[PDB]
Symmetry: C4
Subunit: 161 residues, 4 copies
């Protein structure tokens, strides 16, 4: 069945959790398997509504591709990034929803701010969740994301069993 | 069943061992599994009582969370840390026991001192065990803790099997 | 059966994909197994023929040995390499085909150019495919190749099961 | 059964191969398992006797403990080490055999010399095998030894299965 084992960071204003989502395979007629739908590392952000109380129903998600993970784990202390997603980039609903995830170092070198912005021109909504992440917290992410990378890529099927 | 395979460092005044402790899961009614109790890397310290003789009955433990491990593996040659635990932080026995684990570089850059202090205001006891750890010893810890991190986080359940 | 899960980079002029190929073992009469044919990381290059359209039938391959992988993952930002293969080095067809794979940093420090040249004196052909690879893309390669290294070496058979 | 999958480096004057050797466990009466005999990374050196011809019968071995591996993988470009073993350190045959393994950078930063010396005062023999190891070759060792470390430590038994 499924597995639920998120790594979570809960701060003053919001929470953030991360969990791998495996790729799917289509087993070929010929034999063996071919990767179908891509793996990602899924991030979930949700708002604080009173000390250590957070509102799960107002959560927004952001799917990190292998390449975006690649970019996160190779971030140095002084490095910054920003990723842009349209959920319906290729469909008829393109331009309606825009998500942006940014990872900004703080002056100190003591951590990062990770911020998810979700703008929805259909529902006319504009949400932004921001979570500070210490160096150790980000080192857990970097280590756990690096461990997960080969899995979300499907390369763990290449084992001498 | 269980598994016992500690990595151990025995020095003049004390010993130190480290071993991962897996998280537990509750299998859901719906199907699949959800992480319940957290994994840690468990450290055990105990006193030397005569050359290469150590007193197992006087051992004290300290559970490293994923984030504390994160902080250890991202320690540089010149870096120092200190972690504070109350075993009964949330219960009625709060303030009775205080544990502190510190990791201090030595001047040389030749290793670290890892020291566990346990203060117990109930039994009116005050114990401190200190173990020097060479660079190679700590490199084993860093490598083995880094390997263990995804496991104590439960992320090893996310495998394409 | 087999497994197909390439990591792919598609750029203006060409595409590049990488996938591990496991080593084979011969199970001994005595018992247990002995590595026979070597593992590699297989690269496949093929030409773009119109935006995001690529010509699979004109693909050329290059097999990275463990040592070549070793050399790739230990490449710094400013580092360059070049590998030379003769497919029939030891046979009677030596000198007919020459393959060369080069990895050159771009001035920026923003990525690399990976280029495969295939010269065939039998068919009198001369092909060259070039693919730019950002830092994040190469960080995925470095991480995924590093994860694959023990597998293509066969060292994953050494598990306490 | 057993598994044979050495990583090998063959040079002008000698060869060197490395292979992990798993630890053994004693399954407890109570249940589950306890590590018994330690894992190591086993090195084998043997002499060249004519171009790409090597004399397997004159091989000498050296068992790298986890801590020695720790020391190898944390070696920098400019770093050197030397390890000393007595095969019968604790027995009555102490002082009869002395093995020494040294890893010396070459001036260039282009690789290392790894040299095994075996002195046997019983058979009055004195053997020394030396193998140059490029940066890429050593990067394979460092990566493969790092991957093997948790296994030779027995920490791979700690999996959420």
């Amino acid at each position: 069945g499924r597995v639920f084992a998120p790594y979570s960071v809960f701060k003053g204003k919001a929470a953030l959790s991360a969990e791998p989502r495996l790729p799917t395979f289509n087993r070929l007629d010929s034999g063996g398997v071919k990767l179908n739908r891509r793996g990602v590392i899924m991030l979930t952000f949700w708002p604080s509504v009173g000390e250590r109380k957070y509102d799960w129903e107002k959560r927004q998600l952001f799917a990190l591709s292998a390449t975006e993970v690649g970019s996160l784990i190779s971030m140095g202390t002084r490095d910054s990034s920003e990723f842009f997603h349209d959920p319906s980039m290729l469909s008829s609903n393109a331009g309606q929803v825009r998500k942006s995830l940014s990872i900004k170092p703080n002056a100190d070198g003591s951590g990062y701010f990770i911020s998810l912005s979700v703008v929805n021109n259909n529902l006319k909504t504009n949400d932004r969740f921001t979570v500070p992440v210490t160096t150790a917290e980000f080192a857990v992410m970097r280590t756990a994301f690096s461990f997960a990378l080969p899995h979300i890529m499907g390369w763990d099927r290449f084992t001498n069993r």
